[PDB]
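Quick one before lunch.
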Amino acid sequence: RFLKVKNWETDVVLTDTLHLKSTLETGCTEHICMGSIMLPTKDQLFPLAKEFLDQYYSSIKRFGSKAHMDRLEEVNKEIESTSTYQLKDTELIYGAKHAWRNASRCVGRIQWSKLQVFDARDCTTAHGMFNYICNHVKYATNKGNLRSAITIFPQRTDGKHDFRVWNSQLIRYAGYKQPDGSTLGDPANVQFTEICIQQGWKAPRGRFDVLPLLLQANGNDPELFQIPPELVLEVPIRHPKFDWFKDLGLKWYGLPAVSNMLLEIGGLEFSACPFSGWYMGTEIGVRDYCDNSRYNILEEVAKKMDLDMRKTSSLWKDQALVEINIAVLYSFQSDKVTIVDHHSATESFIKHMENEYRCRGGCPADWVWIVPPMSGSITPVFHQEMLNYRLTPSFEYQPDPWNTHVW
Amino acid sequence: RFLKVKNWETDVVLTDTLHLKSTLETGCTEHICMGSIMLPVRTKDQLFPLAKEFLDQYYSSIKRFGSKAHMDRLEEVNKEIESTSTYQLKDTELIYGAKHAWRNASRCVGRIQWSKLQVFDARDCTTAHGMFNYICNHVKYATNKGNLRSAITIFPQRTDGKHDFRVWNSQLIRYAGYKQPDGSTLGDPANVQFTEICIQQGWKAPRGRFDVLPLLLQANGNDPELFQIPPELVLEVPIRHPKFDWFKDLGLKWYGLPAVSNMLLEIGGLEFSACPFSGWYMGTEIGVRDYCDNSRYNILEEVAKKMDLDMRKTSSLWKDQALVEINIAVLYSFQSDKVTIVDHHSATESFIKHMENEYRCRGGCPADWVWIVPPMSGSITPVFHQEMLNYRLTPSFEYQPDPWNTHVWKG
Ligand code: HEM
Ligand code: HEM
Ligand SMILES: Cc1cc(N)nc(CCc2cc(F)cc(CC[C@@H]3CCCN3C)c2)c1
Ligand SMILES: Cc1cc(N)nc(CCc2cc(F)cc(CC[C@@H]3CCCN3C)c2)c1
Ligand SMILES: C[C@H](O)[C@H](O)[C@H]1CNc2nc(N)[nH]c(=O)c2N1
Ligand SMILES: C[C@H](O)[C@H](O)[C@H]1CNc2nc(N)[nH]c(=O)c2N1
Ligand SMILES: [Zn+2]
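Model of the KMD complex:
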């Protein structure tokens, strides 16, 4: 019940006690492990509020103080009365930072305490949402010197007045299926791209078209907005050795900004809470470019490299993959846009884990997501045993809005 | 109940009902997943239900469930247990058991081959010398001059846990490791403890970087004895690179036959503590793990040095570049010497086909994603995108503690 995790490359052993504070469920049982599955009233609200307020006042070393009890009392009163409650700015910031801290699938959490939190709870319209999001993007991008940030729109009330960003990321490329039969641009975004067009958007029908924002305030119909191009920092992808690489015509955007998740703090639900950091190179070079269900350029690159693509055992896919990921890192670094390679990022996470085990008693971590999609075992996280469990505050998935929206 | 797994690249969805037949635990709870943890004595009491369940499965597979042969066998095993406190498997049952232990091995990506396993019955063995002979025959059979053949040799089952047969080696063929006074290691660092034991038992070590370890064999609970595998039985492959001529001068080689010899085979409640099995290598086992783990031969530096890569910052991906070249060399060398090997793209593609087939005919396929996904180029293999369910079926292979930690020495 007091658990140990071992690193098999270093023999370092850490003792986990934090998991005992876990609340939600993992999807696993004693009979079956679901570790590789992608997606497994007034009464309930006050205990949730109490659990959060307790950990908050503990963190500021005022557990059991007058101010603690008073606040517990005040929130209790507000829930009995209004059937909900509002977070103090200090509580909102703490809650958001700890949602990141608790994100077991995130390798970048060593940065968790340096999150810029933008309070957008006074927002009432989609035009206001757009304004807040432009300011976010500009602050976060910072001329290529990226800074982590989250913008938090008003919390769910009766589930009919939800704030939602319909895009999965603030910045993403459009996808269109060709009459020919293939897919132009990003296949991942074919459905969403349709809903943009099938709602007003005029598509350039290109390969790297930055999608418009589809913003929904207070449960209303969502509205289209184009992010000012001058706020969208993109990087042309070239290679430090292969001069034909530039001719592939590839580029990617600098800002990874997830906008479709749900932030839970003290029982309150923030259905619109776009957050952003900076990329690990493999997210673009391995997944975005080389997934078969994405831009899928491996064969094209291997061809230009003149590799022997007759047999899989020549490892031509593997060679091309490395070169593509060299290009991505080289390109961002050259344009002075923040990026981290998978070696640096995983070494950072090992350091973070040790910090958390020492100062917090543990660090929930999902091995399946933490290990990079290339060169797994030559990164230290591959050899690191990890315990996965769910702490709150937390980021959670939520249904795509078009399936839920009472139109 | 139904359970569905989705492949996120193909959108293919499979339905698992087989997990309902699961008995053993996973280590996970509703509150914590232990999926990345490496490693998460038996009386007459619990034995007959274990026996019965296995025999039910056996007779079902041969389309004889409930037959007179089935009921008689149950009867016979029952009376054998209550009078002798154990029982003996028929040859047919043993073969079925061994094949299904492999079939049920959720961490094994090579299971498309499970039904083609050569089972060698060594249950009549009584001495370490007898063990050595059986093991030599296994190695010769399995190696087949490079045309590798899967096989398992099964020594007598545990009785009171005080007369165990054990192969003290983790694998039948492995290179020695030597700790030097300056803190460095000569050979395979993984095998330093075992090497020191062999030396203590009287092995005259050559003290080179690739010395094949002697077999250390325990029969019937007796102290183990040293044996040298005839070198002519140990097939090795010099490693060279198809473009880089300097690669051969690194002086690398590896053995052709992967043969695990320290696991326990459970069949119908019976425990076979010595059951060496072998197949053929996936290239990455050697090229990624054996050669490039920091705690193993660790040749990334040397290789990258000779490739003249930018080694100052990690973001040059010099480690990733060297890793691919090493794995190309391993595959090239094995194929050139006509020794059976499979690359991780072929192996994972075959596993997906296997898994889909198993869902269709068996109702499921227990699989451990953490182990099934290869240690390089993960997401460009099809298993990366494949949801998997991990659960435990029997018959099974299990870990057991190393014998030198539990053995009562006779002298
Ligand atoms: C600052 C640098 C950051 C880096 C390098 C980073 C890296 C990553 C990576 C590689 C993943 C894997 C997800 C995938 O493969 O699609 C991930 C997941 C995740 N990240 Fe981070 N991230 C960063 C910042 C942040 C921030 C600022 C937040 C929130 C405030 C965050 C929250 C999350 C969450 C909630 C997930 C998992 C989502 C899920 O469950 O699917 N990350 N991160
Ligand atoms: C014939 C070709 C085979 C291939 C390519 C293959 C491949 C693999 C690989 C790559 C692993 C991961 C282990 C590691 O990374 O160290 C593995 C695990 C395993 N294999 Fe196979 N294998 C083969 C044959 C067999 C046979 C013949 C048996 C048994 C009769 C077997 C039983 C197992 C078991 C039980 C594990 C899991 C070990 C554990 O739980 O830690 N395999 N295999
Ligand atoms: C802030 C941030 C930094 C970074 N460096 N990277 C990302 C993107 C990674 C990511 C984070 C999430 F919080 C949620 C998701 C969605 C999961 C995706 C959707 C489809 C495939 N995958 C399941 C991705 C975000
Ligand atoms: C038949 C076979 C084929 C193949 N292609 N390959 C192997 C070796 C893979 C393997 C299988 C096992 F049943 C147990 C182990 C030991 C795991 C090691 C020991 C220490 C670190 N690691 C946990 C390896 C065996
Ligand atoms: C901590 C983690 O479970 C451990 O390093 C595992 C990860 N996956 C693996 N997968 C395979 N095939 N072989 C291994 O030795 C390991 N090691
Ligand atoms: C089926 C499997 O869970 C799925 O492919 C996961 C595996 N691990 C991952 N890991 C990360 N970081 N991102 C992903 O999208 C995935 N996909
Ligand atoms: Zn689990």
